[PDB]
Write a protein that binds this ligand. Structure first.
Ligand SMILES: Nc1nc2c(ncn2[C@@H]2O[C@H](COP(=O)(O)OP(=O)(O)OP(=O)(O)O)[C@@H](O)[C@H]2O)c(=O)[nH]1
Ligand SMILES: Nc1nc2c(ncn2[C@@H]2O[C@H](COP(=O)(O)OP(=O)(O)OP(=O)(O)O)[C@@H](O)[C@H]2O)c(=O)[nH]1
Ligand SMILES: Nc1nc2c(ncn2[C@@H]2O[C@H](COP(=O)(O)OP(=O)(O)O)[C@@H](O)[C@H]2O)c(=O)[nH]1
Ligand SMILES: Nc1nc2c(ncn2[C@@H]2O[C@H](COP(=O)(O)OP(=O)(O)O)[C@@H](O)[C@H]2O)c(=O)[nH]1
Ligand SMILES: [Mg+2]
Ligand SMILES: [Mg+2]
Lengths: 426, 428, 428, 426
């Protein structure tokens, strides 16, 4: 009854989308050919939320893959589970954005956005009642940032009453991948603060921290980080696909977590996460899950939650569990750390419980936190942008594409206003 | 002869309805497919030959919870038309439940209530199950009660609601929804029975010796309370009270129509052996604050009226002696202008227990319904939460975007303050 | 899908191209006859059946050097019309290469590039290999760059050039040609990768333990560098970088486009056994002055932008750790206005080794493209030599007799002084 | 592609021409009948630069022989390799110059130069692209000096864009073979400074010194001197005939060596040169070659290079070698002797390498030096000319042929200007 469409932009977006679709197919018992092979009918009752029935009992994911270079598209086509995607959904260009926001937003993005919007319009018209849109992309790149921004703007113009979710990776604090990262990040945030409903900020350094300290992984690989992100993504929308005691869809989480429209930047977390040698040394119960949530070590954003205050918190639990334990433990964790919770919002925590746990686990849970410590990341990105723009470095690359310095100034001012607001409500 | 219609709204109302109808089917010997191998006529309709269908309506703006009913064990029990489902939930938003999403489906529900009413010859009233904190269970419930009062008028309507707990709450915007729903349904509900999840959690942990109570246990206990209330209609006793008697004996003033329910005895099989459960001891247990089903302290309040529903092997003389003993106790107090504050009801059929349940089989039981000024404390804490949240205008835009107005917020605040003032004036 | 076209000009360019195409044929398993027993299409075209022809153009104003190609082992590899030869060499004269002899052959070369580009669908840009000191490699290369910029425009052009060395130089009039060609191709270049002869001599003598390096070893090393640069296009990896990304990440200002190249690890088989070649230490080795491919001092300069290209068994976490360790080091420094100074690209294909070569087979390799202000020192020594020679008007009549004017010398001097001023101003 | 046409004038010119053609034929594997008998195809790839294919796989040299008496031509025709020359190329008179510049330039030169010019014009039109001309002659003779200068003037009129080289033997300081040597030498250099591109000065006593001290030759003969000169001549143009790593033709050497048009007088040298006994006592390496180059004993001009400064230096190496050694040793020899190198010319040395070494030798190299010390030779010739012209000795021999004393004064002034410039740039 409720439908979710998927969009993947850029190399990072495509890779996370591939991992997420593999995880979802594993959950629903669908083999890489599109034929259902599960046992429990619960895997099939709400399968339409992510899959389309295309005759012959074959299910095709409701996804659109977008990129300005064929490389990642070819890699995802040739890789595992690359067959199930519809060949018409692969919309790819030839030039490539070259890690430039202006190229992906103004030059090549303008050319490709018409075809991408046509495909997304056909997909949305094919469904009965879409819940909303979700997009995976990066804010440091040229294809991801600019193209996903233009796409979000176009859909928000077309479908104003639907939910827009994004799972975007923000630039890392310590070591950067691209030289021009701050420009793209600042412009992308400038557009996101207006054109989206909720954003989940992911940091690669946080994922490395998790994989090293918590998962005891000797040699982490990008596949593992995408695995963690996909686990979070599956955890968020679990109540739309399986029955439970207390159900919460995307709109419920939105109405519970964002008090003011510009304050919709969340940090996600997942539990449990244990190494190979450490499974035997813990009894998997609700106390351990809720302890693993409220911990800076387990956060997927490179921001310390104890440097600020939580505005709202959402905890989505999966598995057969007792509601009394959940409620009393949320109350207890609120009581013990009252210094980290905003005083003028009683009951900062919103709860939801789903009966079906992920395959292989008896219990699992997903944490979404709207804290004011994201001001640190925004502040440092703004500071780097100011340092670069002071000397007009790399400015001709963006200016030659038709961009103006006024756009840079507007983006800087908007980020400063947002950090001012986040400091104000602290 | 005289019939009764049940309406279940929202997730909580629907699940309570499943528990209640399972208990009714167990009591009257009706199989889950609707057959049985005639006082049940007040709750089940007879269709065709050897098929009994409940006189119930199930409403929810999202399909999953009622899809569970349509797929579950009691799929054959319910008429497929009287299970109404929407496509989008209200998402913990009173405005969506009232205006934006509520008005699309209310006409079909009203048609279904009317159709259930045509088959009624002696309809006594309506029972509504819902929660104060939810989106649909608040907004659509309020809209439904307004339309029902407009359409039917003098027929009594009774409420069974999930009042938000003082410190244990699930949602964040609960104070808004609670204040708005009381403001809207104050004048349209004849009487409301509130229960609290925290109190039932405590009762299950202490008296039933359960470590991890779930929602199913709470629903089972609530269904026991409801069955105790309606046993007078569904059977024949020595001294019985119907739906109208509750309203005419519990409300001293129209605006103060908020009694609370208390059930006894709630013990497991382990402790049932070491107690000779007489009438006097269960009557005493009904008055103790740790046994009450709403997290609140009757010690700081004053009783205006009490209703007792005796069930099973009970004789009137022991009842009268227990009432006298309660009256002499100085620890509890009745307000001065009510010299007589007790309503007594005695029934013969003992309480049936569901297989696999947590309660043990007992000879006698009591369901207490009393009006106490201590509800003003819970009202005050709710209003304080509302004031704290509304001082910053947090989450207002969600309600405004769906077609509401801040003037409605101010009106609800003023009305709840007036209700608190009325409670205080009654107290003295 | 996407294609890259190579141009080789002059003796140095032709020989470097020979080494490069040998390495490409080895990497893609193409026999010297063009047959093989599909990512190679970016460098090889497919004609008929079982034949691959390189997308290259070889130009020289004297026939002997290309006659060696046409008579050598790879005579069957190249298309006979893409090996263009003149009759008279420019004789280390910029005027002869640019006007007198260049204009007789330029149109044929332009026609050949047009025919080659007609067969490409996703052409990325042009790679030109040439030498600064030679008459042809300066004059004709500048003419070619100007005409290419006029005709194609936005398509990127990259240069691999032989910088004149500080103390070891072959010709006498080299400063004249170097200054003139830099002044001419400043405005028509997107980025130029710079190498020097005695630098590679030192690397071969020290790290490779070779006593008497020849031109073949230098050309093999340059081939390895170019293969490392284009591996992102010719294969698939964890994180790829195309031609445009280099230009957009390494060039902060239009007139500052002279990064220097650096390759690691360059070690023989003797010392390969006694070293565990991981990511970290090769990353450090890429940053030391003794290993860079231009005889220059970076310790007295400031880095502006850094690009690292990893090949083989490399994981991103080790790359991140190595970059962090480099950043925390004080002995090297980054300019203030560039807080983020690194660009990372990772490829899966390990480097291939030619048979009989000097480098050993290694699991991982790094190509470093660094933009630093230290190039101003080599600039300054070049201007010192040019001014000292031009004070006496020595050899000017040779250039004037071919149709050049002393005003061109003055303009080149002024432009080079302006470039030095720009570098110095950016440095602070 | 590039063709060189050879000219021989006078007795000395004809003798060195015969020796040079013998050496070249041996290098290219051509028997004294004109038929190819070598093995390596490299001998035949660029054979057209000196030989014409005259049908029946027979090659004839592209050379013109000139003399005013049949004697030397009869001798060269009768001697070894005399048959390969084309009979029509023998242009001879009957009178003879009698060691008089006037007769060779005005009286008999005028009559015979038209026929010589026709022959060279035919030869040049036969070739497709000529590099230039080279002349072998003497400045102390009458036929050689006059005819060589007149021919040089005529060709420079006819072909102004082509390189003009001369290998001229100058009058020598200690002993003089002719009484009137300075007059002929004076007029010869007067014409040479204006009408040539580069001239290589050869001195007989320099060759005698090399043969005695270096080659340990007890009884040197003109054949050995001409053999050395031929070795130098073949070394100069080796890059035009054989492949190499770094190639330098005549034009490259000119543009690298002559900074001002009047300063094109070089002093050539050759290495290695060892006797029969001394061949065992050294290892043939680049250090020994470059040591033998920079030594006054090894130079073919009777001028000490240490009495002046080197303006430019060209070193043409033959054989398979490493370029690193070549560059490092040129730098080293530049550094050690900074007092003998001009300060306002960085990199006085130009290098070139050819893969094919001369037959019999593993390595060889040729040195061309443009040094100020030639001022000593010019000054000596000028002083002798002035000394004889003060007394008007032997002046009637030159006057009776039509010459005027003004020509003598002009030539004297030209030497004075030349020596003044050479001193100035010192
Ligand atoms: N006693 C009891 N209370 C319940 C049960 N299920 C939900 N609730 C209460 O309902 C409150 C939230 O409202 P819901 O019923 O879940 O939501 P809703 O009424 O369907 O309205 P929507 O937000 O539109 O879904 C929670 O705070 C619970 O206290 C139940 O099974 N038993
Ligand atoms: N690294 C390297 N440098 C070379 C090579 N060949 C020539 N060079 C350089 O080129 C410079 C001289 O220019 P050349 O390439 O020889 O001549 P050109 O570029 O063809 O121009 P012309 O003088 O007209 O022939 C020398 O100083 C060398 O440093 C080579 O194979 N490898
Ligand atoms: N978590 C994660 N991050 C990635 C992945 N691939 C790239 N990234 C990040 O994305 C950034 C590069 O942006 P990119 O998507 O390549 O630019 P684009 O091609 O223009 O969209 C880098 O900072 C990487 O850290 C991936 O597979 N997983
Ligand atoms: N190196 C060398 N010099 C010679 C040879 N024959 C003559 N000479 C020199 O030439 C001079 C004689 O001039 P000559 O050629 O006979 O006069 P011409 O007949 O007018 O050209 C003498 O000074 C000799 O030194 C020779 O075979 N080799
Ligand atoms: Mg609900
Ligand atoms: Mg050349």
């Amino acid at each position: 009854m409720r439908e979710i469409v998927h969009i993947q932009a850029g190399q990072c977006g495509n890779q996370i989308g591939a991992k997420f679709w593999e995880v979802i197919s594993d959950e629903h018992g669908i083999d890489p050919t599109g034929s259902y092979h599960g046992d429990s009918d619960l895997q099939l009752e709400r399968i339409n939320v992510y899959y389309n029935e295309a005759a012959g009992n074959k299910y095709v994911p409701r996804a659109i893959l977008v990129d300005l270079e064929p490389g990642t598209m070819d890699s995802v086509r040739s890789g595992p589970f690359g067959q199930i995607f519809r060949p018409d959904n692969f919309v790819f260009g030839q030039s490539g954005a070259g890690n430039n926001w202006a190229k992906g937003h103004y030059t090549e993005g303008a050319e490709l956005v018409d075809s991408v919007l046509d495909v997304v319009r056909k997909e949305s018209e094919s469904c009965d009642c879409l819940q909303g849109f979700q997009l995976t992309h990066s804010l440091g790149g040229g294809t991801g940032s600019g193209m996903g921004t233009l796409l979000i703007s176009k859909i928000r113009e077309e479908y104003p009453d639907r939910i827009m979710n994004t799972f975007s990776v923000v630039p890392s604090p310590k070591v950067s991948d691209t030289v021009v990262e701050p420009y793209n990040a600042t412009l992308s945030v400038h557009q996101l603060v207006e054109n989206t409903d909720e954003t989940y900020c992911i940091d690669n350094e946080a994922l490395y921290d998790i994989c090293f300290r918590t998962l005891k992984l000797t040699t982490p690989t990008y596949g593992d980080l995408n695995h963690l992100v996909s686990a979070t993504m599956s955890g968020v929308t679990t109540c739309l696909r399986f029955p439970g005691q207390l159900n919460a869809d995307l709109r419920k989480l939105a109405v519970n977590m964002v008090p003011f429209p510009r304050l919709h930047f969340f940090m996600p977390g997942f539990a449990p996460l244990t190494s190979r040698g450490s499974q035997q040394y813990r009894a998997l119960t609700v106390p351990e899950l809720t302890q693993q949530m409220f911990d800076a070590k387990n956060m997927m954003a490179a921001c310390d939650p104890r440097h600020g205050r939580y505005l709202t918190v959402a905890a989505v639990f999966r598995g057969r569990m007792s509601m009394k334990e959940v409620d009393e433990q949320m109350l207890n964790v609120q009581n013990k750390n009252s210094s980290y919770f905003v005083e003028w919002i009683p009951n900062n925590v919103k709860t939801a419980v789903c009966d079906i746990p992920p395959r292989g686990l008896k219990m699992s849970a997903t944490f979404i936190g709207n804290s004011t410590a994201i001001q640190e990341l925004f502040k440092r990105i703004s500071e780097q942008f100011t340092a670069m723009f002071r000397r007009k470095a790399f400015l001709h690359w963006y200016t030659g594409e038709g961009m103006d310095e006024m756009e840079f100034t507007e983006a800087e001012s908007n980020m400063n206003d947002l950090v001012s607001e986040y400091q104000q409500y602290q | 002869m005289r019939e009764c219609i049940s309406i279940h709204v929202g997730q909580a109302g629907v699940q309570i309805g499943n528990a209640c109808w399972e208990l009714y089917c167990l009591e009257h010997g009706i199989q889950p497919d609707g057959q049985m191998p005639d006082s049940f006529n007040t709750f089940f309709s007879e269709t065709g030959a050897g098929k009994h269908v409940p006189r119930a309506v199930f409403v929810d703006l999202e399909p999953t919870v009622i899809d569970e009913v349509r797929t579950g064990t009691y799929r054959q029990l319910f008429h497929p038309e009287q299970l109404i489902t929407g496509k989008e939930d209200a998402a913990n938003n009173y405005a969506r439940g009232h205006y934006t999403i509520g008005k699309e489906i209310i006409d079909l529900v009203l048609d279904r209530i009317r159709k259930l009413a045509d088959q009624c010859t002696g309809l006594q009233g309506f029972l509504v199950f819902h929660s104060f904190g939810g989106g649909t269970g608040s907004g659509f419930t309020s809209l439904l009660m307004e339309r029902l009062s407009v359409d039917y008028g003098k027929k009594s309507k009774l409420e069974f609601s999930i009042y938000p707990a003082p410190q244990v709450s699930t949602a964040v915007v609960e104070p808004y929804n609670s204040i708005l729903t009381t403001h809207t349904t104050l004048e349209h509900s004849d009487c409301a029975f509130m229960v609290d999840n925290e109190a039932i959690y405590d009762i299950c942990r202490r008296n039933l010796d359960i470590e991890r109570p779930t929602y199913t246990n709470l629903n089972r206990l609530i269904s026991q309370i409801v069955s105790s209330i309606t046993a007078s209609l569904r059977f024949d006793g020595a001294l019985n009270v119907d739906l109208t008697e509750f309203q005419t004996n519990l409300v001293p003033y129209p605006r103060i129509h908020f009694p609370l329910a208390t059930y006894a005895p709630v013990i497991s099989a382990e402790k049932a052996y070491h107690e000779q459960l007489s009438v006097a001891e269960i009557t005493n247990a009904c008055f103790e604050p740790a046994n009450q089903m709403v997290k609140c302290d009757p010690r700081h309040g004053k009783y205006m009226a009490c209703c007792l529903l005796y069930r099973g092997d009970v004789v009137p003389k022991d009842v009268n002696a227990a009432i006298a003993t309660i009256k002499t106790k100085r620890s509890i107090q009745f307000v001065d202008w009510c010299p007589t504050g007790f309503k007594v009801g005695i029934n013969y059929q003992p309480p049936t227990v569901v297989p696999g349940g947590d309660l043990a089989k007992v000879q006698r039981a009591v369901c207490m319904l009393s009006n106490t000024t201590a509800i003003a404390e819970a009202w005050a804490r709710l209003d304080h939460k509302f004031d704290l949240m509304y001082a910053k205008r947090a989450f207002v835009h969600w309600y405004v975007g769906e077609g509401m107005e801040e003037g409605e917020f101010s009106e609800a605040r003023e009305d709840m303050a007036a209700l608190e003032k009325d409670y205080e004036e009654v107290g003295v």
